Amino acid sequence: MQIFVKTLTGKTITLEVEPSDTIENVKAKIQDKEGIPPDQQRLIFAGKQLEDGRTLSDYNIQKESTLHLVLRLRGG
Amino acid sequence: MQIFVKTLTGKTITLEVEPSDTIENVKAKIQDKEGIPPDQQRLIFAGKQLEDGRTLSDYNIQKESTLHLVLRLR
Amino acid sequence: EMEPDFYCVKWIPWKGEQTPIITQSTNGPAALLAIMNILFLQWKVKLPPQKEVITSDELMAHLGNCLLSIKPQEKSEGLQLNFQQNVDDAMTVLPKLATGLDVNVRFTGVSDFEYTPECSVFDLLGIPLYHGWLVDPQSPEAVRAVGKLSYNQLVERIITCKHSSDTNLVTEGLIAEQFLETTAAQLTYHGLCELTAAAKEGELSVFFRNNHFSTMTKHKSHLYLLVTDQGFLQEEQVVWESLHNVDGDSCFCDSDFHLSHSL
Ligand SMILES: [Cl-]
Ligand SMILES: [Cl-]
Ligand code: NA
Ligand code: NA
Ligand code: NA
Ligand code: NA
């Protein structure tokens, strides 16, 4: 299954996942491609933040769905 | 767009850049204007070091911002 | 120095005494350094004279000791359960100070953040926590679109508005979006003005601007930020950076807030 992750800058990240994948898994994949730490990532879909312990299937995220990635404000 | 780079000697370097430019690119532009090798350059904005590999956009560096140029650690 | 766990110590002549401040080489420990530099400047934690290098572990240990030594203001034998809870949850977030501390600013006031354990670390130590990311009143649309929303709420709001049928919401989304783009470096002129008036003369505080934490003070009605970048380690005369505009064009000063130079 292939899904899309849009940032606020307009950039889009393509991901290869499975309905059984946890939100934590997806965040790990986002770290592999962008280097953003999972704990700074907040994923949004159909008006709700996606919780780490739930699956894509739990949120009814099917192929070619678009999620929105927003970052927490972290001062390094 | 235009940014400014202040040295500790008081000298100001004007640069033509884009938000998409990497910190590397900017250092190269400084090496075109002044004698200074990129690897001797350390760029700071609002008290924080700007790392090579990131963009101006990554650091929210808008037009007519002033960066500070000092000498590199490593 | 080069290693992430190590930090170069800078000795400066602060109020008649050789006093240490910690410099930063890489991104991540800004919050830890902002707090510890306050403690060092207040002489609440003290280092061996001419100590040159210091570790995250050390800084954490000093900070741990200070936090756990704080006493409740009520100073009453009864109750005080609320205080101990604060202490516990602050100790839990403490490691994040070294790697990157999350904050959720409110654009309504210089002290407005969502109250979280992260914020509680500053509260316990009696250290004010500030930002200058304030929506200007002069712009009515930004004040209504942004409202009382935190950064975290505003970004979701934008997503919703982007998808909404209601053309009023679409419009609000675009104004809020515009506000975040133009104020992306997270300090507005209105915020800088409000912060300059709010901050207390001689008081040390932490200032969150552009995904960074700084040690801030006010001297003769003017804001200053402690220079911590290790690029300035050898520059004894470069201690305080002036904060009188949003574009980064600052004046450097020595320990006593007198203009310095290298020419
Ligand atoms: Cl030592
Ligand atoms: Cl005052
Ligand atoms: Na979209
Ligand atoms: Na402004
Ligand atoms: Na103080
Ligand atoms: Na100056």
Domain boundaries, chain B: 2-71
Q: Which ligand is nearest to the CA of C200?
A: 2
What are the CA-CA distances from residue A46 to residues A65, C113, C176 (Å)? 10, 26, 20
Residues 6+ apart with CB under 8 A from C79: none
Contact between residue A73 and residue A42 where contact means Cβ atoms under 8 Å apart: no
Question: Quick one: tokens of B41?
Answer: 């350059």
In angstroms, this model's resolution equals 2.2
The amino acid sitting at C139 is S
Query: What is the DSSP secondary-structure string of A26-71?
Result: HHHHHHHHH---GGGEEEEETTEEPPTTSBTGGGT--TT-EEEEEE
E strands, chain C, are 6-14, 17-22, 53-55, 101-103, 129-130, 204-208, 213-219, 222-226, 240-243, 252-253
Q: Which ligand is nearest to the CA of A65?
A: 3
Length of chain C: 263
Q: State how far the Cα of C62 lies from the Cα of C98, in Å rounded to an integer.
A: 13
Residues 6+ apart with CB under 8 A from C40: C19, C20, C21, C22, C46, C47
A60 CB burial (10 A radius; 0-12, 13-18, 19+): exposed
The shortest C-alpha distance from C248 to chain B (Å) reads 5
Residue with the two structure tokens 């207040």: C42
Fold exhibited by the domain A2-71: Ubiquitin-like (UB roll) (3.10.20)
B27 shares contact with chain C (CB less than 8 Å): no
C10 CB burial (10 A radius; 0-12, 13-18, 19+): buried
From chain C, the residues in CB contact with B68 under 8 A are 248
Instruction: Give the Cβ contact number of residue C5 at 10 Å.
Output: 12
Report the run of H or E that residue B24 belongs to, with start and end.
helix B23-33
Q: State how far the Cα of A18 lies from the Cα of A63, in Å rounded to an integer.
A: 9
Contact between residue C141 and residue C104 where contact means Cβ atoms under 8 Å apart: no
CB–CB contact C31 A42 (8 Å): no
Contact between residue A2 and residue A64 where contact means Cβ atoms under 8 Å apart: yes
**Starting from the edge strand earliest in sequence, which strands make up the sheet with C213-219, in order?**
C129-130, C204-208, C213-219, C222-226, C240-243, C252-253
CB–CB contact A8 C102 (8 Å): no
CB–CB contact B73 C184 (8 Å): no
Technique behind the model: X-ray
Q: State how far the Cα of C180 lies from the Cα of C174, in Å rounded to an integer.
A: 10
The bridge status of strand B41-45 relative to strand C17-22 is unpaired
Report the run of H or E that residue B26 belongs to, with start and end.
helix B23-33
The shortest C-alpha distance from B21 to chain C (Å) reads 17
Q: Mutation test of the interface with chain C: which of B5, B9, B49, B65, choosing the one with the most C Cβ atoms within 10 A?
A: B49
Q: Mutation test of the interface with chain A: which of C97, C101, C113, C228, choosing the one with the most A Cβ atoms within 10 A?
A: C101
Q: State how far the Cα of C230 lies from the Cα of C228, in Å rounded to an integer.
A: 6
The bridge status of strand A48-49 relative to strand B12-16 is unpaired
B45 CB burial (10 A radius; 0-12, 13-18, 19+): buried
CB–CB contact A76 C211 (8 Å): yes
Q: State how far the Cα of A16 lies from the Cα of A14, in Å rounded to an integer.
A: 7
Question: Quick one: tokens of C43?
Answer: 């002489």
Query: What is the DSSP secondary-structure string of C195-250?
Result: HHHHSPBT-EEEEE-SS-EEEEEEETTEEEEE--BGGGTT-TT--EEEE--SSS--
Q: State how far the Cα of C58 lies from the Cα of C22, in Å rounded to an integer.
A: 12
Contact between residue C56 and residue C110 where contact means Cβ atoms under 8 Å apart: no
From chain B, the residues in CB contact with C24 under 8 A are 48-49
C262 shares contact with chain B (CB less than 8 Å): yes
Q: State how far the Cα of C250 lies from the Cα of B44, in Å rounded to an integer.
A: 12
Q: State how far the Cα of B66 lies from the Cα of C147, in Å rounded to an integer.
A: 31
Q: Where are the domains of chain C?
A: 6-71+90-133+186-253, 140-182
C185 shares contact with chain B (CB less than 8 Å): yes
